[PDB]
Design brief:
320 residues, 12 helices, binds a molecule of 3 linked components (NAG-NAG-FUC), 3 chains, binds a molecule of 2 linked components (NAG-NAG), two-stranded antiparallel sheet, binds 2-acetamido-2-deoxy-beta-D-glucopyranose, mainly alpha, elongated, 5 strands, Spike protein S2' (chain B), part of a larger assembly
């Protein structure tokens, strides 16, 4: 998802100016269109989050005993000693990716709407997906969750990649140790090797840049004597003031139109990304994928979700 | 067959009563109508001119004075057309993505059986059927959903003669006293046998291996045949 | 008498899968489900 924004034409263009608002009425329903487009974008953001994360019928919990055949899920399981029961990796992600410019944006008709699902609910959904996938395997994604020992589920997955399950049963400690080493290296390689995790920051930066440019276009005269409506209204009679007011209206209408068009294109891109993330949650987390390189490099065994600011992180466990 | 018939009979109600979807096609129609209505309603805006009617401006002014109003109207209407076309292009991109998805669903859910999870409905996909709708398609996904689960004790392997046996295809289950081999998606318990198990190593490796009997059909059949052979011998020898 | 009320969202029912070292749940029945997906073309 991306930040939901709301823009008031009257405040942005003709802020608390009656003459400018009366002149702006002469341009028709441009602002009804801008408001409708932005509302669609915001509702689509909430839809994106709902489709990616609300994929569990029930909020599954892991049993109080956290033994899963020798596997170390503690760094991805929820941490109850916290206000939000975010995992270790989820908290690392939320600390690294972080969302006056904001006050100034809020000061001219540009507001930011909170998402419908709080970070606590996204964390709850991710925890339910994790508990379902480690206590039941892929059964919870196709009906009621059917419990199975984790070693036997791993034997299922080895069968699914073409290896006999006795290879897992006779190497269970080694496979558990390798998984624990890899899941312990994840906490470093997620923020040190970079690569990704720049997509979420890029989304945040693009949204902030768009808002900053929109509120900075209020300083352009666009050919008028001044960029301040109060100044023009104070220094001229109405017949001479309307010319400057109209230059400012044209410039600010253009700036708003450009902002909304860029937001629509970006929201289309983010909707494509969210559809991909939803498909990955369905086919990598809720099941085992035979599609090559869809759920990581190698023969896909399983995948685990973590929530990140405005996005999701998939830890793909594969056999090489 | 009865379950499928019941579900396909409930489809005719749940398609228009539960709502959920079928609002996407209506939303497409409504967005197109809204765009056209707004485009043709922008013809009433003066955009700073004396009037929004070209005939009025042409009738009330000489050409040199009329061109100013004509140009204001041209600028406003050019902007309205540009906005309409840009919104149409973005919407058509979205619809092309949706149509590519629908084509992939027709190929992989209707023309075949999909192993992709939740691609062709919730559950284990059996088949799918297409129906045409105004400006779109409807897929009736027929899937298999396990219904009445039961507890069992389970083991990764069975130890019989110092050898570990693993299921060829299934799981070992126990109601509490006896051990069977069942398929993982439907409880159909079968006697554990050398036919449905394979031997790998000894019993000192697998964690959770249990002791039970694995029956050899060859040995049992040989013993039963030798009993009849002994009877046939004793018929005349003794 | 009906009135407008506000509340916090319920994400769903609370379920604890009875995970154990050697417990497995096996289905003994099945259901044929016909669901619907509408796609704009
Ligand atoms: C599984 O069986 C082994 C072997 O025991 C033999 O086979 C059994 C089915 C039964 O017929 C026994 O009488 C046979 O001797 C068990 O290993 C034995 O463990 C006991 C107790 O520790 C020990 O006194 C014996 O010497 C062991 N026998 C051998 C050959 O090592 C094993 O404990 C059984 N597994 C379980 C989980 O009970
Ligand atoms: C499942 O079996 C494991 C061992 O195979 C159990 O883990 C042990 O639990 C006991 C107490 O119950 C502890 O003293 C041991 O230290 C644990 N061992 C390890 C390696 O963690 C586990 O408790 C069993 N039960 C469940 C419900 O998982
Ligand atoms: C599962 O993982 C956790 C954390 O990755 C392990 O906890 C660590 O245990 C060591 C050894 O006592 C401590 O020095 C660390 O400080 C612990 N880390 C944390 C974050 O608490 C835990 O031991 C692992 N469990 C098993 C059974 O191996
Ligand atoms: C498997 O499930 C089906 C469907 O619920 C069961 O069939 C029902 O059986 C009851 C009891 O006789 C009848 O009243 C219903 O009419 C049946 N439904 C249908 C659609 O035929 C069936 O009994 C279940 N099988 C087992 C072994 O429990
Ligand atoms: C499996 O056993 C647990 C523990 O008693 C129980 O809560 C659960 O309902 C059982 N499942 C079934 C399908 O009977
Ligand atoms: C387990 O199933 C077998 C096969 O019918 C039966 O003989 C045995 O008594 C069952 N055990 C229990 C506890 O029901």
């Amino acid at each position: 998802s991306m930040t939901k924004t709301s823009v008031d034409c009257t405040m942005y263009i003709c802020g608390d100016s009656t003459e400018c608002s009366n002149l702006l009425l002469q341009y028709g329903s441009f602002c009804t269109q801008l408001k409708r487009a932005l509302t669609g974008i915001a509702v689509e953001q909430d839809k994106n989050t709902q489709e990616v994360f609300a994929q569990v019928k029930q909020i599954y919990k892991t049993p109080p005993i956290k033994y899963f055949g020798g596997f170390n899920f503690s760094q991805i399981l929820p941490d109850p000693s916290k206000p939000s029961k975010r995992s270790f990796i989820e908290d690392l992600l939320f600390n690294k990716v972080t969302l006056d410019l904001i006050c100034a944006q809020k000061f001219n008709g540009l507001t930011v709407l909170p998402p419908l699902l709080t970070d606590e609910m996204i964390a709850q959904y991710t925890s339910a997906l994790l508990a379902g996938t480690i206590t039941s395997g892929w059964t919870f994604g196709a009906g009621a969750a059917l419990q199975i020992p984790f070693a036997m589920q791993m034997a299922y997955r080895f069968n699914g990649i073409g290896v006999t399950q006795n290879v897992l049963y006779e190497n269970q400690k080694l496979i558990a140790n390798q998984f624990n080493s890899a899941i312990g290296k994840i906490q470093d390689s997620l923020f040190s090797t970079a690569s990704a995790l720049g997509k979420l920051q890029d989304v945040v930066n693009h949204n902030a840049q768009a808002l900053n440019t929109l509120v900075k276009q209020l300083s352009s005269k666009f050919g008028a004597i001044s960029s301040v409506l109060n100044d023009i209204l104070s220094r001229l009679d109405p017949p001479e003031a309307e010319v400057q007011i109209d230059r400012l209206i044209t410039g600010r209408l253009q700036s708003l139109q450009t902002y909304v068009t860029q937001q629509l294109i970006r929201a289309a891109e983010i909707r494509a990304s969210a559809n991909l993330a939803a498909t990955k949650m369905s086919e990598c987390v809720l099941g085992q994928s035979k599609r090559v390189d869809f759920c990581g490099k190698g023969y896909h065994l399983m995948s685990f979700p973590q929530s990140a600011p405005h996005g999701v992180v998939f830890l793909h466990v594969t056999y090489v | 067959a009865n379950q499928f018939n019941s579900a396909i009979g409930k489809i005719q109600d749940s398609l228009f009563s539960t709502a959920s979807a079928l609002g996407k096609l209506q939303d497409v129609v409504n967005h197109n109508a809204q765009a056209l209505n707004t485009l043709v309603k922008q013809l009433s805006s003066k955009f700073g001119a004396i009037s929004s009617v070209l005939n009025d401006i042409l009738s009330r002014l000489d050409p040199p004075e009329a061109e100013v109003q004509i140009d204001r109207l041209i600028t406003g209407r050019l902007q309205s057309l540009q906005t309409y076309v840009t919104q149409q292009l973005i919407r058509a991109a979205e619809i092309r993505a949706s149509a590519n998805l629908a084509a992939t669903k027709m190929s992989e859910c209707v023309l075949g059986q999909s192993k992709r999870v939740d691609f062709c409905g919730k559950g284990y996909h059996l088949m799918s059927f297409p129906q045409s709708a105004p400006h779109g398609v409807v897929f009736l996904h027929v899937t298999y959903v396990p219904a009445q689960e039961k507890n069992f004790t389970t083991a990764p392997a069975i130890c019989h003669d110092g050898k570990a046996h693993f299921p060829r295809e299934g799981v070992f289950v126990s109601n509490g006293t006896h051990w069977f081999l069942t398929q993982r998606n439907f409880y159909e318990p079968q006697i554990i046998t050398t036919d449905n198990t394979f031997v790998s190593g000894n019993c000192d490796v697998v964690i959770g291996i249990v002791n039970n009997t694995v029956y050899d059909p060859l040995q049992l059949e040989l013993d039963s045949f030798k009993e009849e052979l002994d009877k046939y011998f004793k018929n005349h020898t003794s | 008498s009906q009135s407008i009320i506000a509340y916090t969202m319920s994400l769903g029912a609370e379920n604890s899968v009875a995970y154990s070292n050697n417990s497995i749940a096996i289905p003994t029945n099945f259901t044929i489900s016909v669901t619907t997906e509408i796609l704009p073309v």
